[PDB]
Design a binder for this molecule. Structure first.
Ligand SMILES: N[C@@H](Cc1ccc(O)cc1)C(=O)O
Ligand code: NA
Ligand SMILES: [Zn+2]
Length: 435
């Protein structure tokens, strides 16, 4: 029935393939949680579905339509359940439209944050990893089912808005502004950035990555601390370093939305949600790395968060070396940090664990061990192939190990496996060197 996630066993619907969310969100008073929504989901299926079952937590649906037609629906617990006139079968699509309104609820965990629709200091914004997007959007709230997004945000004329995707039009009537954003590459629900309140959009010159053009804009909310910046030149340099390692940047634009709040940063798509207290070079790199690892390559199961966070963390070492710093010393710093902490196999079994130090640093050292085993050329080739292999296909730890085995051989697979499996922390991975 549900996606069957090992950590959050009730989220999502088995076999559902949401392909596009067309969301019109209306936020009457930014900074206060009440809101209203008009969303049309374009949905397909991997198995015959007699119902469409979406996650929703807080708001109440008041109307539903299927292909422009009246349809049976019920809202029960944390789900909206839509009974179809006939089964939705693979290869077909339909349009499910839902009208809803009310107060998004924050999930209260274990987790670093209470994810969902945040409200503070005149700002409302999504910070919804892992499973908070369902607070303000009826959705298949699981990273195994990424989708494209077109968002129209209606706000009072004194406010502005920013969502993931390129900004096109802003219209205004009766004291209300409506802004349209189009996210054209599919990302998990939690990677939908959406911020309303006092903010300004600021463009920077395009970045050229060979034949690929990446547009540049950052969001600056009002009231940022003195010195809250995106240093000139930095984002282009990080885009070059990381894309040279991972393959083409997956999106049409990149930037950060700087918020005067105190909170973790989140890799929302092409527009990282960046509270000022997290605004550091290494964090900016890390969140950009997640545009590949997490947003493009998405998780089959939340137990495997290390494939996002370990890879994003390892990107910080790749960045550090590109800036002339000693990568092995950084790996040693990761190890020293872990050597006084409990360790675990990389596949998490508890919600407490999915963003813990093992997911970030034990996962990063796993990739360090692999890299030192196969050499830098093979390792960079492997990362390119990894991103291509799990584009349009959610990744798992088993699938990674299979790819390493076939691409890099059984010895490379065993090197990664000792880091993946095993309750005790392995020794620090160190260069072979001459005999
Ligand atoms: N994904 C963030 C951490 C985070 C986790 C959950 C959140 O809701 C927000 C942020 C990172 O890259 O470290
Ligand atoms: Na999908
Ligand atoms: Zn991360």
């Amino acid at each position: 029935q549900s996606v069957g996630d090992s950590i959050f066993p009730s989220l999502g619907q088995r076999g559902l393939d949401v392909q596009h969310y067309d969301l019109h969100l209306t936020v009457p008073r930014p900074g206060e949680p009440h809101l209203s929504g008009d969303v049309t989901l374009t949905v397909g299926a991997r198995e015959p579905l007699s119902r469409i079952v979406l996650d929703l937590l807080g708001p109440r649906v008041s109307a539903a339509q299927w292909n422009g037609q009246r349809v049976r629906w019920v809202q029960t617990a944390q789900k909206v359940e839509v009974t179809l006139p006939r089964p939705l079968r693979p290869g077909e699509t339909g349009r499910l439209r839902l009208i809803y309104a009310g107060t998004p609820e924050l999930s209260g965990d274990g987790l670093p944050i209470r994810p969902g629709w945040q409200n503070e200091a005149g700002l409302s914004y999504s910070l919804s990893e892992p499973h908070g997007t369902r607070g303000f959007l009826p959705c298949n709230d699981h990273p195994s089912d990424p989708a494209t997004f077109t968002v129209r945000v209606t706000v009072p004329a004194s406010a502005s808005a920013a969502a993931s995707g390129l900004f096109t039009t802003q219209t205004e009537r009766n004291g209300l502004k409506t802004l349209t954003f189009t996210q054209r590459v599919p990302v998990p629900t939690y990677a939908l950035g959406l911020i309303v309140g006092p903010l300004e959009r600021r463009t920077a010159p395009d970045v050229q990555l060979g034949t690929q053009t990446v547009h540049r804009r950052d969001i600056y909310a009002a009231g940022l601390p003195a010195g809250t910046t995106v240093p000139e030149g930095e984002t282009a340099r990080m885009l070059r370093v990381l894309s040279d390692w991972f393959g083409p940047y997956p999106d049409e634009v990149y930037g950060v939305a700087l918020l005067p709040v105190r909170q973790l940063a989140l890799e929302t798509a092409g527009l990282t949600t960046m509270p000022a207290t997290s605004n550091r070079e290494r964090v900016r790199l890390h969140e950009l790395a997640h545009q590949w690892f997490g947003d493009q390559v998405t998780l089959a199961d939340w137990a495997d968060t290390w494939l996002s966070e370990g890879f994003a963390t390892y990107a910080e070492l790749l960045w550090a070396e590109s800036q002339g710093e000693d990568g092995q010393a950084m790996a040693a710093d990761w190890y020293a940090r872990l050597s006084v902490l409990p360790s675990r196999p990389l596949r998490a079994t508890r919600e407490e664990e999915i963003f813990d130090a093992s997911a970030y640093f034990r996962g990063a050292l796993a990739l360090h061990a692999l890299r030192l085993k196969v050499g830098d050329a093979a390792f960079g080739q492997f990362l390119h192939s990894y991103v291509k292999t799990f584009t349009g296909r959610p990744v798992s730890t088993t699938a990674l190990l299979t790819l390493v085995k076939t691409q890099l051989g059984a010895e490379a697979e065993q090197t990664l496996r000792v880091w993946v499996e095993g309750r005790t922390l392995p020794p620090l991975p160190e260069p072979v060197g001459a005999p």
